[PDB]
Every structure is written in C-alpha cells, then in structure tokens.
C-alpha cells in the first residue's frame with residue numbers, strides 16, 4: 001500500500017506560510033480556551049493522534065489520508081477532546097479550502113509547536129484525502145495505564161526507537177489531562193514548549209495516587225502529575241538515561257524532538273524524488289506580525 005505525496009496544485013512555500021500565519025494568528029486571538037492555555041497543546045495532540053494510527057506493517061492509518069474527518073475516527077474514545085482542535089481549524093480550512101485535511105492537521109501541530117517557542121519543525125506538503133473506507137479502526141492509539149515495556153513495544157509499530165519515544169513524550173510539557181476526556185486529571189497549564197517534562201520527572205517528589213475516576217497517576221505536592229506511561233520513562237533504565245540527557249540539554253531535546261515529530265507526521269508517505277524540499281516556516285514573531 002503506497003501513498004505518494006502530491007503537491008496541492010500550483011502551491012508553493014508562500015501559500016503554506018499563509019496557512020501557518022492564519023493558524024498562528026488564531027492561536028493568539030482565541031486565548032481563553034481551556035482556562036487560558038489556548039489551543040496550542042490540543043493542536044499538537046491532534047497532529048500526533050492523526051499520525052499515530054499508522055501501522056508500519058501494512059501502511060494503514062497515518063496522516064496521509066486525513067481520515068480524522070470521518071465519524072469512526074473522530075469518535076474514537078482515544079480522541080476525546082480533539083474535536084476542539086478540529087473546530088479551531090474549521091475557519092482556517094474555510095479560508096484555504098485547497099489544503100488537504102492531512103496537511104492541515106499536521107501543519108496545525110507544527111504551527112503550534114513553533115508558536116509556543118518550540119523548535120522549528122520542517123514540514124512537507126502533499127498528503128491527499130482518502131475515502132471513508134480507508135479510516136483506521138479505533139484502538140491503534142496508546143493506553144496510559146501501562147509500563148515501559150508496553151510503551152516500547154507500542155512505538156515499534158510506528159517505527160520509533162527509545163530516543164525517539166522519549167523525545168516525543170516531552171510534548172507532555174504542554175497542556176494538561178482532563179478527567180472527562182481521558183480519566184486522568186491535572187498537570188498544570190503550560191503553553192510554552194520547553195524540556196520541563198524531563199526536569200519534572202527527575203526533580204519532583206512523586207506519589208502514586210488514585211484520581212476521581214479511580215485511575216492511578218503520579219502526583220507531586222507542587223501540583224504536577226505524570227501518567228503511568230510518563231513515569232515509566234524513569235522506571236526503565238534505558239529510558240532514564242535519555243530523560244537525564246534531555247533534562248540537561250535543551251538544545252539536544254529540541255533537535256531530537258524536531259526530527260521525531262517530523263518523522264511521526266510523515267510516516268507512511270512516499271515523497272517523489274522531485275518533490276519540494278521540506279518547508280521551514282517563519283514564526284509570527286520572526287515576521288514582525
């Protein structure tokens with residue numbers, strides 16, 4: 001099963017910079033969402049969930065086909081809460097109806113990372129909408145109540161190794177869990193991309209507690225939380241070494257996250273030899289906007 005990137009007809013960097021800018025300006029504007037967190041973190045999670053359905057074994061799922069727009073995937077219990085991200089992107093799609101759904105969802109995640117002061121994430125266009133019958137079944141996204149071995153095995157299906165997994169998990173610096181979405185609660189309210197997830201893991205005094213949904217999570221008296229799968233990164237000695245590395249080197253974390261996130265958003269896509277190079281979009285701040 002082959003998905004060949006096909007550039008939206010006649011479009012080039014400047015077109016996609018315009019879409020980036022529209023997303024970024026709306027991120028600035030709609031600042032009240034989720035107790036003033038803003039839409040940045042949910043857009044990152046949306047880009048990951050539309051990509052994280054991929055299966056390397058048969059090339060099903062993945063960001064290419066934009067299948068989150070269909071009911072089966074939109075209604076996946078694992079995706080509860082992401083409708084807010086979809087709704088945010090609706091007026092962007094109405095203004096730029098030529099962009100494919102997979103390109104829009106993945107670009108939303110790139111734009112959010114960068115606008116939240118994260119690393120630059122090179123991004124490639126050319127995902128093409130596929131029909132409703134290509135929508136992956138529910139159950140391909142990961143459970144949070146599990147251990148390091150589960151996490152490691154899970155991510156092999158996405159062709160990610162230990163360093164890639166630990167780097168990607170650093171996105172849990174962003175946003176928060178919501179009891180009604182996932183059965184986990186808390187995590188404060190950060191909307192600036194940093195390596196703080198790793199600092200929090202190593203430096204806080206963690207207690208294993210039950211939340212109001214009767215699920216276990218790790219809590220600190222400072223008011224932070226970690227999912228069982230988050231905490232597994234310091235329980236496993238291979239993951240712990242990498243956590244320590246990222247806790248001690250912001251730039252390395254940024255560079256490794258950028259690579260892993262681009263890879264995640266491109267899994268399953270065949271780029272022709274004569275496709276455009278990846279685009280690196282300027283932030284609003286870089287443009288003086």
Ligand code: HEM
Pocket residue numbers: 041042044045048080081142143144145151168169171172174175176177178179181182183184227229261
């Ligand atoms: C073992 C892997 C992972 C598990 C089990 C997991 C689980 C979760 C859970 C349960 C939530 C809370 C959802 C809610 O209540 O609203 C969440 C939020 C989030 N996840 Fe993950 N996640 C994983 C990996 C990732 C990855 C790889 C990324 C992106 C690179 C990511 C990005 C985020 C973001 C940004 C949020 C916050 C969303 C918000 O504030 O609305 N997650 N994740």
Ligand SMILES: Cc1cnc2ccccc2c1N
Pocket residue numbers: 172173174175176177186187188200224225226227230
């Ligand atoms: C501090 C922390 C830890 N884990 C998280 C998992 C998902 C989303 C946000 C998180 C978060 N802010």
